Amino acid sequence: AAVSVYAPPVGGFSFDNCRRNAVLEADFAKRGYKLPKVRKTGTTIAGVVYKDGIVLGADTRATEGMVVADKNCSKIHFISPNIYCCGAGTAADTDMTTQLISSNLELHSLSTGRLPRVVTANRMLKQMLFRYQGYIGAALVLGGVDVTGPHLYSIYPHGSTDKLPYVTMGSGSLAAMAVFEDKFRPDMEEEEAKNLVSEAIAAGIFNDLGSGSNIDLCVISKNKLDFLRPYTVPNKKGTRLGRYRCEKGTTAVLTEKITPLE
């Protein structure tokens, strides 16, 4: 194998790139070259606590700068039979940091024989996020009904937590949460809550640049789990007027190889 190894390898986050990365970045910053970017999907997320269950929802645009990378990307994940979460910003990190907790809670549920409780998910997420002090940003909206009653949480990318009856996190959120501040009343009904959250997310999607396309809702009522996707289509692409298709022989060719498989 190798002749210059002493200790067995150890897993975890590797770090054998920053020494080269720093000098490369210093070289390329002053020369006006291209710069790396990540899918900072600043998206609106809304959640309300009505009389019986909880309703969630988020927009489905995933940008990577000034260019629309995706037109359909689910912002709602699966954690347990009766717990859902949401992501906001740096979707790459939020996907893994939700899947890990989902698997851990599944193990706990299998070992206990009863449905998990939201506070456990909150505790584990808080512990992990505070362990990784900064350097990983995933604003979440954790909501789910349990044996006690409805619950909601507003985890921040530094470890803070809250128990609001309604919350709106993400890049463009002020419009939706102001709509909430204007229209929300305590102890509403199911269809009214769905209409309210749809209206708030529509205001947020219209009056911002980081959001667009379809919306969806995740009603998680006591004895019925719903996942509607998509729920409403606010914008529809038009139609192409003139045909611009190219026929056979349009493009040239230099060499060609044909290999048959089985």
Partner: protein, 203 residues
């Protein structure tokens, strides 16, 4: 940082046919040292990968992925489903999330059982996403969505698919200094693989 070298790759889903194409160039900034430098790797038989970005990490990620794919294939017995490689590369990239690599891979292939075309994509640090119609990534990312969005069409036969993937690259990649001088087209129909080499402006 994806300007120290060049590269551009597409992927279109037609009618039981998937096409992947790249650009052959390797040069240190303004200078150019070679014209032939493969960026398409034959992982599996009816599957392919399309690494594009900084080359010195492209080689390493390709080697590691090939190693792990051989291990899984030998241990588990039968071939790998196209969806599995998506999570494969996602895990491999997130391995060094803090010390990030520089690759924007594209995966395009067919299901060995269902023969249902599949296309996906990835960002720098691993964020899985699947688009039905097409996807594109590379140094010249901006000047391809406009060329591809209008020219695309659903339910395309292999000939029209080849024509569209040729026209969305040949006159859309020359509008940039780096990442030019040659185009390789890989068309993967149901039964036989076929490779073609276009000709473009030598500048």
């Amino acid at each position: 940082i994806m300007s120290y070298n060049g590269g551009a790759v597409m992927a279109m889903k037609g009618k039981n046919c998937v096409a992947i194409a790249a650009d052959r160039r390797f040069g240190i900034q303004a200078q150019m040292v070679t014209t032939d430098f493969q960026k398409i790797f034959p992982m599996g038989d009816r599957l392919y990968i399309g690494l594009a970005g900084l080359a010195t990490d492209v080689q390493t990620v390709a080697q590691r992925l090939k190693f792990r794919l051989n291990l899984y294939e030998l241990k588990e017995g039968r071939q790998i489903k196209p969806y599995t490689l998506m999570s494969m590369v996602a895990n491999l990239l997130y391995e060094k999330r803090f010390g990030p690599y520089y690759t924007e891979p594209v995966i395009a292939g067919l299901d060995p059982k269902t023969f249902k075309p599949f296309i996906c994509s990835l960002d720098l640090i691993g964020c899985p996403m699947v688009t039905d119609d097409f996807v594109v990534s590379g140094t010249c990312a901006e000047q391809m969505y406009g060329m591809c969005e209008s020219l695309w069409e659903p339910n395309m036969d292999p000939d029209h698919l080849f024509e569209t993937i040729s026209q969305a690259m040949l006159n859309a990649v020359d509008r940039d200094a780096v990442s030019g001088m040659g185009v390789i087209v890989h068309i993967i129909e149901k039964d036989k693989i076929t490779t073609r080499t276009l000709k473009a402006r030598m500048d």
